[PDB]
Amino acid sequence: DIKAENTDANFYVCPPPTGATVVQFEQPRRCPTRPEGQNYTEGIAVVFKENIAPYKFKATMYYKDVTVSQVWFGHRYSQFMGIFEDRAPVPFEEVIDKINAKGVCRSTAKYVRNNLETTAFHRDDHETDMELKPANAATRTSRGWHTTDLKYNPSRVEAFHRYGTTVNCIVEEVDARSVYPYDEFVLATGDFVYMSPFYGYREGSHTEHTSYAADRFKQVDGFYARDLTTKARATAPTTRNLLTTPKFTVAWDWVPKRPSVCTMTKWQEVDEMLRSEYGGSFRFSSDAISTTFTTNLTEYPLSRVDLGDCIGKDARDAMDRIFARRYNATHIKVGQPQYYLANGGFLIAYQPLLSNTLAELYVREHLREQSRKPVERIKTTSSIEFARLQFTYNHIQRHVNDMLGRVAIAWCELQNHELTLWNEARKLNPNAIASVTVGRRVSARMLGDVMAVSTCVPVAADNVIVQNSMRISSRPGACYSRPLVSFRYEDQGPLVEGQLGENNELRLTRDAIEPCTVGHRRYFTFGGGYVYFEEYAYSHQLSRADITTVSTFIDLNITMLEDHEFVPLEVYTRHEIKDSGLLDYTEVQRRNQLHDLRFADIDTVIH
Amino acid sequence: DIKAENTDANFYVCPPPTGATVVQFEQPRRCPTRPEGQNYTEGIAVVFKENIAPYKFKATMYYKDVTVSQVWFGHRYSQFMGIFEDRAPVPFEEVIDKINAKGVCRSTAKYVRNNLETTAFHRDDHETDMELKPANAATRTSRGWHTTDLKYNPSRVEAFHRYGTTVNCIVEEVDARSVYPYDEFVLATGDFVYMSPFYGYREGSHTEHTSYAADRFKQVDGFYARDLTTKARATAPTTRNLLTTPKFTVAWDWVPKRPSVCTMTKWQEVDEMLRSEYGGSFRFSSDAISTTFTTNLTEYPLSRVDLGDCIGKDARDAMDRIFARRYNATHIKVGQPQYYLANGGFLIAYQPLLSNTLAELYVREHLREQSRKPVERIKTTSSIEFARLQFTYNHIQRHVNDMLGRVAIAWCELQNHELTLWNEARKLNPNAIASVTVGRRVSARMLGDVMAVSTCVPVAADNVIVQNSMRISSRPGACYSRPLVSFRYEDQGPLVEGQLGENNELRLTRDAIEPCTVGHRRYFTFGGGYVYFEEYAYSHQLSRADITTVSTFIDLNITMLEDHEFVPLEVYTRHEIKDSGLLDYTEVQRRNQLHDLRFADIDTVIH
Amino acid sequence: DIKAENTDANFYVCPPPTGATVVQFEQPRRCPTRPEGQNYTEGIAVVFKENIAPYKFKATMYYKDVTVSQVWFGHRYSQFMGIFEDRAPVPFEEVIDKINAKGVCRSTAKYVRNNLETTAFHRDDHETDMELKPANAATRTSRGWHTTDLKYNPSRVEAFHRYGTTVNCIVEEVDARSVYPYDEFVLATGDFVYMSPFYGYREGSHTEHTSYAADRFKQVDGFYARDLTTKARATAPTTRNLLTTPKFTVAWDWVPKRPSVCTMTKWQEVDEMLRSEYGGSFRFSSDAISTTFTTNLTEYPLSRVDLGDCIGKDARDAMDRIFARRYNATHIKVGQPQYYLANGGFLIAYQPLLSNTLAELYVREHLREQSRKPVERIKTTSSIEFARLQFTYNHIQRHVNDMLGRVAIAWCELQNHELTLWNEARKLNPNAIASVTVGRRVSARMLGDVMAVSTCVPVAADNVIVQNSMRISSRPGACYSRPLVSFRYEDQGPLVEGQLGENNELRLTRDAIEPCTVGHRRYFTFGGGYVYFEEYAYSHQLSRADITTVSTFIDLNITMLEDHEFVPLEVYTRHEIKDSGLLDYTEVQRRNQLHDLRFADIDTVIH
């Protein structure tokens, strides 16, 4: 007769439970604990990296240009038979006496060449004084001075061969380099000198190239140079080396070798560096830098380091400086500065810091720090980046776990408390609770604390019918609150008496009756929709859609983090760098090699 | 007699609460709000980086090889007294007239040398000027041409000296380079020329120190060159500079200095660049690039930039181009392009974009953009990476906070609503609720809205006993639903009457009785396990394990993100790159450096 | 009379609901599912990068120094008329016979020069054999040997010109480098040679032409060199090329061209490399490396690669090696090694791995792998970093989504179950539940399953009054549990009878009465605070603050991840690299280029 409007829903019948099945609720679970916090030491660190260093210094050169020329005189014309050009060293004596003090130089050159002592006279004059003047201007040049502008050719005699001599004294300032602190350091030309800026009265290597009298090398102590141009005199003395090579004499100031070089560089200063002890290793993270470094716990011998006085020198300087500014009132130092080597070959100097508040701790901390305290070069990697990645990675990870962990605990605790609610709740409606718990529809009743359960049998939607009239003829004055129904499990046959219950439960028995009333209008969950009864009478059927909905649940909107691709990005390619400067190794090289071909002709061979 | 099987659990007794303690539930808490969303402007940006680079151009050289040789004739043999080789400039006139137009060149050279005008006649014959032909093939060479293959020497006359002269005209192409305008640009030799292609009356440069003799430099306007090889004539005129140096004459095309030079490079184009305003700074993020840039709000003066016309030129080009493709229908431009300088020294040009939909906004946006609008070089860092890190970091952070924040709100709201459930729940069972809330077992009853509470006293597990028979002799026909028990607080003494309650509560009074029934089987929470009663009679005891469990709680499985280590990774070690820069190392490096020493003559002196 | 102490709270009245409004609870929502896990293949990979490579090789040079000098004898003194210096090739025959086998050289030189065959004799007397002896020491040399220490000038005769000739045999290892795979290569001396080891003698190269007579170039097969110094004989033969240039003869060992040069380098080995198939691309992630690579699915032709035999050679070597150590028992290989090209131009060789457990799978996997299997150089980027970023980014993202996703499901499930609790709960107190659900105060009653609702009307705090005495005169022996009140909606007028209800509900009707009792003390929610009644009598009023609070809610503390800034950080910067060097490249170049300017002598031109 009246069949459910809405097919979609299902129906169940639930026989009363018996002994046979019983179950218990789980008791509250133990909760996770938040991890002990990591402890961070405060401190100041400076970082050092490996360095080049070249050797660079200044020098002066004194040499003279000796030229002799031959001329043949033709009737109309003249021709050069040949021109001879030499360089002559200026003597130690001449340099000091003539050039340096006076600034005046001598025209004539007297030097050994080819195991012969040759002499030249300028402009075959009487020996005369010459006054040096600065060299003609050129861009990007060092200073230089020269006596003689002009060349001297023999006076004209017809049909004769003649020789003429010129001398030009030259002095120049030199930039000197030593690729390897060694026998040789180089001149502007790249003309080599076998001498060293370092030496130096005393050295082990003193032996190395000396089986000697003085002879060539001479040192003046307490040398005061005077500027040629200014003719100012040096305020302070130096030790002046002069080496006389056959071509020329060079002079420079002597300085002790060791302090000159030294290798290591002080990359950066971190006001706040944190040291962490994890994993049997140390972490130093610079917040600003956003780098983290990993080091062994043990400290790194400075003594091991070669040439590297500087490191201590710098380290204290920065540390002292930093402490005063930021630290001074605020914090107290613990222990003395410490050095660690970190992957990437960065050397870290650390100065642990203690807060004033903490200060009582100071004794204990000091002891620990001290225990840490215990020639090769250190190689450094070009790329920081890994440290930065480490820095970034850890921090983010730090947050994620921390926040998530809290949630988990919150979740767990929430569940435990909730159980209390559920316990009572099941009491009110064992079926509803039982069904949800099991996850299937079931019938249950409480036996004592424990709850019995039995499963329910589905009934076809098709086979359900609702009775038209709630009210009871037999015993008037009473009306049953809920509808009655008929149904059967299988299609073919029998019809079963029964009545409706909450959530489409067909209860076999029709116990529950209430006093009749007026204005008695109700809705019942029937099938997909609701069945509508009015005045204990059948009305129409509805669907859920008709009725406005409200939601128990609290919404959460969670979205994924979408994927991203990182494409190779570089300011510079390898090629670009090579191209960059200067300009090209390749371009230059191609040009240079070519040079002989274009300019000079080897080629011609003839039978 | 009947003692609990399962020790593990505890027992409590809970006396009824009095006035003395009362507590209230907390009221719902205020919830966090989701942050206002960040606003992002759309736009198109191009990025620029610093670049040096130096200047190159083509040039041609005309010079002649003048050689004179001496021979002595021995009886059998001949020997060279000596060979003289010179270069002679080819005259301006000769170049234009002879070489250029005709392509023919002449044997004879006439130039000043050593303040003398010397002349040479090639292969001393009454003069001929044959022609030029291309130079012999070489790899990686520029073009060149030369009149004379062979060298000429005097005919043999015995026991006499003779002189012979040769002339070979040479013309060559080849590249020229000028780093920057000053003073000289370089020719192949490593010799220099100082002329400037660059200037230019309309330039400062003329001022720079000048000799100057008029003659040497000459400019031809409306020059049409003809290719020597092809003998094609140039379609279009150029301005041809020729400079005659004593060695040679060089010619090239004059070009205005400025447009050639200039600097900064257009690194990349971003179709979609987002500008964000945070922190009193700007963020530009390129999604594809995955870089973010930080800039000051204020714009960066282009005028400040030195040599840098290009930037505008490029910027518009890209922007216009980009807009049409992607943007054209879709979006409308706002304002004119804007430039910002970002850390890392990247210059960003930005063109703000507006959507069509938004367009009404357009007036307002325009005003804001405009307000932004307000010689040095800009230095750029090699490494992008920090920006990328920033890009990566922010995005991830963005997600994490966003998602988490939502959860927190959801959590909060959930709690508030839950309170409603709890309020009723406590009503049903004040003890259970009260206990959980307090976190200890307590007894409570409701006085009005407020709930009173009192604490409970633990009872020893050992001292508890259960009565065998539920049923009551005295008043038959009634049976007590729950078991009765005896217990005492302390070991030694007295026994107390009492009965069981939920969760091992020993209630002093034994009120609650129900009608007797059959099939009355129940479980009670007793100690660790359950006590089993059948038919109002004692049966056996059980443990919890025996009974299958169901769980209220909804599981969550949360796992930590495990630590990771980043080890230094590099494609290239520094050395390898240097190795790449040709070429490598040690033995050669040893050899080369030495060169001056050995070749310069140490060996000895003869007095 | 008695008005609320605490203003802050509001009051409501709730008329009974009617038909007019009804609502339903939402049914449980479908839950999200956890994504299918990604599948990862295990495998071993090696990575390769692009390489430079240069050519370098050893050489030997044999040449002689031929010098002739002229002297004029002055009365006292002597002078050099001139000195002639030449280099003479040492003959093929001489080298093999004399120098190589004997280690002896000859005084005389005989070579063609200037199309004349000149000869020189040393010491002019006539021949005696000369043993070679090592050259004088210099630091950083290659080896060399020379017969003759000293130079010769003719015996003195007065007023005569005389000639003297000197010959010094010289041999030197020298280093050789060649830019190009074909002929041209250069000495350490830097003189160019046109020859080359490079070509495998049978090669394409034969066609490539330099054409000459046979004599100059000769090859010896089965050459055994003997060390000059040691005078050891070579154990094993080589093929010895000798080229005789006019200046000198050079010899080196011939080797096949191709294998020498070749390309790509084997960057790294990854024990565990994971391949992932996503996005129509492959991901290889190295855990240790913390890089991820993206590749096309298809494999990359090795054959395409130019010079690159090595790759296979290395790849197998590592793979075989790796497998045994880690893999050997543990895993089984699938298929043969495979190669992919990844962005960044890294070539990846992959060897898929299968576990033993899985092994049944083996057939299927093999088929898939095989299907993948299908002259240019590959360019590689300097910077890994993007891959690392990708690696980092993905992993973190992986965690975040995974964990969060779980939470969402947990949340959803939790809500559904909770609904069960709510359903019953509303039953107990429809108003409280209804109000919360709606979010405003409302009145509701249950009609059947569905709940009716109506809204409530706020009442002024001001207009509420409480009745002093609970107890009822009329019917003594009964006392009303809750207080009675009077109120009115608006200020001016009427007073309404009513009574208190939970949460400041003023119920119009005063139904609910309980038996009178003693010790009847209660609290009622009144206004902000509580009203206190004792013994069914009015006492005083309180505030909430007075009473201690307990909280239902489970706390969560969630904090944001704070922003971070990454500042540009570079251990290595472009300038520093360029500088890095001794003295330094930039400084070199500026100085070097300058050289002509300062040194060169125009100096000036005059008539």
Q: In chain B, whose CA is at the least distance from the CA of C395?
A: B561
Q: In chain C, whose CA is at the least distance from the CA of A415?
A: C414
Q: In chain B, whose CA is at the least distance from the CA of A28?
A: B553
Cα–Cα distance for residue pair A244/A193, rounded to 1 Å: 9
Say if C283 falls within a structural domain: no
Which residue is associated with the tokens 């020379």? Answer: C146
Same domain, A73 and A189: yes
Q: Provide the chain A residues 425-454 that lie in CB contact (below 8 A) with chain B.
A: 425, 427-428, 437-438, 447-450
Instruction: Name the phi and psi angles at C395, rounded to 5.
Output: -60, -45
Same domain, C270 and C326: yes
The answer to whether B588 contacts C179, with C-beta atoms less than 8 Å apart, is no
Strands A22-25 and B549-550: parallel
The answer to whether B571 contacts C382, with C-beta atoms less than 8 Å apart, is yes
The answer to whether B163 faces chain C, any CB pair under 8 Å, is: no
Cα–Cα distance for residue pair A585/A583, rounded to 1 Å: 7
Instruction: Name the phi and psi angles at C275, rounded to 5.
Output: -110, 135
Say if C267 falls within a structural domain: yes
Same domain, C143 and C268: no
DSSP character at residue B217: -
Contacts of A382 in chain C (CB under 8 A): 571-572
Cα–Cα distance for residue pair C516/B447, rounded to 1 Å: 15
Q: How many structural domains compose chain B?
A: 2
User: Counting beta carbons within 10 angstroms of the beta carbon of residue A49, is it exposed (0 to 12), middle (13 to 18) or buried (19 or more)?
Assistant: buried
Q: Is the dihedral of CA B433, B436, B441, B447 positive or negative?
A: negative
Say if B270 falls within a structural domain: yes
Residue C522 identity: R
The A529-534 sheet, strands edge to edge: A521-526, A529-534, A537-541
Would you say C58 and C172 are in contact if contact means Cβ atoms under 8 Å apart? no
Contacts of C26 in chain A (CB under 8 A): 549-553
Instruction: Name the phi and psi angles at B501, rounded to 5.
Output: -145, -175
Which residue is associated with the tokens 């260093």? Answer: A53
Q: Which stretch of DSSP H or E encloses residue C318?
A: helix C309-322
Which residue is associated with the tokens 């290009």? Answer: B310
The answer to whether C141 contacts B594, with C-beta atoms less than 8 Å apart, is yes
The C11-13 sheet, strands edge to edge: C457-459, C11-13, C505-507, C496-501, C484-487, C464-466
Structure tokens at B92: 């301006």
Q: How was this structure determined?
A: cryo-EM
Which residue is associated with the tokens 């991203």? Answer: A564
Q: What is the 3-state secondary structure (H, E, C) of B295-344?
A: EECCCCCCCCECCCHHHHHHHHHHHHHHHHHHHCCCEEECCCCEEEEECC
Measured in angstroms, the CA of B206 and the nearest CA of chain A are apart by 16
Instruction: List the single residue in B189, B382, B433 with the smallest CB-CB distance to A420.
Output: B433
> Which of A393, A410, A445 is the last residue before a domain boundary?
A393
Determine how many CB atoms are found less than 10 A away from the CB of residue A588: 13
Q: Which stretch of DSSP H or E encloses residue A540?
A: strand A537-541
Say if A489 falls within a structural domain: no
Measured in angstroms, the CA of A223 and the nearest CA of chain B are apart by 29
The answer to whether C381 contacts A568, with C-beta atoms less than 8 Å apart, is yes
The answer to whether A386 contacts C381, with C-beta atoms less than 8 Å apart, is no
How many residue pairs bridge chain A and chain B with CB atoms within 8 Å of each other? Answer: 250
The answer to whether B23 faces chain C, any CB pair under 8 Å, is: yes
The answer to whether C142 contacts B591, with C-beta atoms less than 8 Å apart, is yes
Determine how many CB atoms are found less than 10 A away from the CB of residue B329: 8
Q: What are the start-end ranges of the E strands in B50-146?
A: 55-58, 60-73, 78-89, 109-113, 116-120, 133-134, 144-146
The answer to whether A569 contacts B49, with C-beta atoms less than 8 Å apart, is no
Measured in angstroms, the CA of A493 and the nearest CA of chain B are apart by 34
Q: What is the CATH number of the domain that holds A339?
A: 2.30.29.100
Q: Which of B345, B254, B245, B257 is nearest to B295 (CA)?
A: B345
Cα–Cα distance for residue pair A273/A283, rounded to 1 Å: 10
Instruction: List the single residue in B136, B567, B582 with the smallest CB-CB distance to A386.
Output: B567
Q: Which of A378, A400, A450 to mutate to test the interface with B (most CBs of B within 10 A)?
A: A450
Measured in angstroms, the CA of A330 and the nearest CA of chain B are apart by 29
Q: Provide the chain C residues 473-512 that lie in CB contact (below 8 A) with chain A.
A: none
For residue A184, CA distances in Å to A85, A208, A375 come to: 25, 13, 24
The answer to whether C579 faces chain A, any CB pair under 8 Å, is: yes
Same domain, B181 and B237: yes
Measured in whole angstroms, the distance separating CA B252 from the mean position of its chain's CA atoms is 44
> Which of B377, B410, B442 is the last residue before a domain boundary?
B377
Instruction: Name the phi and psi angles at A75, rounded to 5.
Output: -60, -65
* B106 DSSP β-pair partners: none
Cα–Cα distance for residue pair A194/A246, rounded to 1 Å: 12
Cα–Cα distance for residue pair B276/B299, rounded to 1 Å: 15
The answer to whether B428 contacts A423, with C-beta atoms less than 8 Å apart, is no
Cα–Cα distance for residue pair B459/B495, rounded to 1 Å: 12
For B159-198, letters b (16+ CB in 10 Å) and e give eeeeebbbbbbbbbebebbbbebebbbbbbeeebbebbbb
Which residue stretches of A324-472 are H helix? 362-372, 385-428, 430-438
Q: Which of A488, A572, B79 is nearest to C119 (CA)?
A: B79
Residue C498 identity: G
Determine the 3-state secondary structure of B403 from DSSP: helix
Same domain, C105 and C247: yes
Same domain, B106 and B195: yes
Say if C496 falls within a structural domain: no
Cα–Cα distance for residue pair B263/B54, rounded to 1 Å: 9
CA geometry: angle at B575 spanning B569 and B580, to 5°? 110
The answer to whether C568 contacts B389, with C-beta atoms less than 8 Å apart, is no
Q: What are the start-end ranges of the E strands in A26-134?
A: 41-49, 55-73, 78-89, 104-106, 109-113, 116-120, 129-131, 133-134
Residue-level length of chain C: 607
Determine the 3-state secondary structure of A317 from DSSP: helix
Say if B455 falls within a structural domain: no
The answer to whether A594 contacts B141, with C-beta atoms less than 8 Å apart, is yes
Structure tokens at C6: 């605490």
Number of Cα atoms under 13 Å in the Cβ half of residue B145 = 19
Same domain, A248 and A266: no
Determine how many CB atoms are found less than 10 A away from the CB of residue C598: 17
Contacts of B574 in chain A (CB under 8 A): 382
Structure tokens at A129: 């004084």
Same domain, B107 and B217: yes
The answer to whether B385 contacts A388, with C-beta atoms less than 8 Å apart, is yes
Cα–Cα distance for residue pair C505/C525, rounded to 1 Å: 9
Determine how many CB atoms are found less than 10 A away from the CB of residue A244: 22
Structure tokens at C128: 């005696």
Structure tokens at B28: 């719902």
Structure tokens at A522: 């109700």
Q: Which stretch of DSSP H or E encloses residue B259?
A: helix B257-260
Cα–Cα distance for residue pair B111/B128, rounded to 1 Å: 18
Determine the 3-state secondary structure of A323 from DSSP: helix
* A523 DSSP β-pair partners: A532, C448
Would you say C24 and C447 are in contact if contact means Cβ atoms under 8 Å apart? no
The answer to whether A568 contacts C343, with C-beta atoms less than 8 Å apart, is yes
* Residue span of the structural domain in which A376 resides: 41-51+262-393
Q: Which stretch of DSSP H or E encloses residue C365?
A: helix C362-372
Say if C404 falls within a structural domain: no
Measured in whole angstroms, the distance separating CA C333 from the mean position of its chain's CA atoms is 28
The answer to whether A405 faces chain B, any CB pair under 8 Å, is: yes
Q: What is the 3-state secondary structure (H, E, C) of C13-78?
A: ECCCCCCCCEEEECCCCCCCCCCCCCCCEEEEEEEEECCCCCEEEECEEEEEEEEEEEEEECCCCE
Query: Which pairs count as long-range contacts for B485-493, CB under 8 Å and 24+ apart, including other chains?
Result: B487/B11, B487/B13, B487/B459, B487/B460, B487/B463, B488/B459, B488/B463, B489/B457, B489/B459, B489/B460, B489/B463, B490/B460, B490/B463, B491/B460, B491/B462, B491/B463
The answer to whether B589 faces chain C, any CB pair under 8 Å, is: yes
Cis? peptide before B582, omega within 30° of 0: no
Same domain, A185 and A271: no
Structure tokens at A418: 């909730």
Would you say C364 and C400 are in contact if contact means Cβ atoms under 8 Å apart? no
Same domain, B209 and B63: yes
Determine the 3-state secondary structure of C456 from DSSP: coil
Strands A549-550 and C22-25: parallel
Q: Is the dihedral of CA A25, A30, A31, A32 positive or negative?
A: negative
Cα–Cα distance for residue pair A516/A138, rounded to 1 Å: 123
Say if B391 falls within a structural domain: no
Structure tokens at C319: 């793979």
Residue C319 identity: M
Same domain, A177 and A268: no
Query: C89 Cβ partners below 8 Å, 6+ apart?
Result: C62, C63, C111, C244, C245, C246, C247, C248, C249
The answer to whether A54 contacts C393, with C-beta atoms less than 8 Å apart, is no
Same domain, C58 and C48: no
Q: Provide the chain A residues 197-256 that lie in CB contact (below 8 A) with chain C.
A: none
Measured in whole angstroms, the distance separating CA A381 from the mean position of its chain's CA atoms is 11
> Which of B330, B348, B377 is the last residue before a domain boundary?
B377
The answer to whether A561 contacts B399, with C-beta atoms less than 8 Å apart, is yes
The answer to whether C422 contacts B427, with C-beta atoms less than 8 Å apart, is no
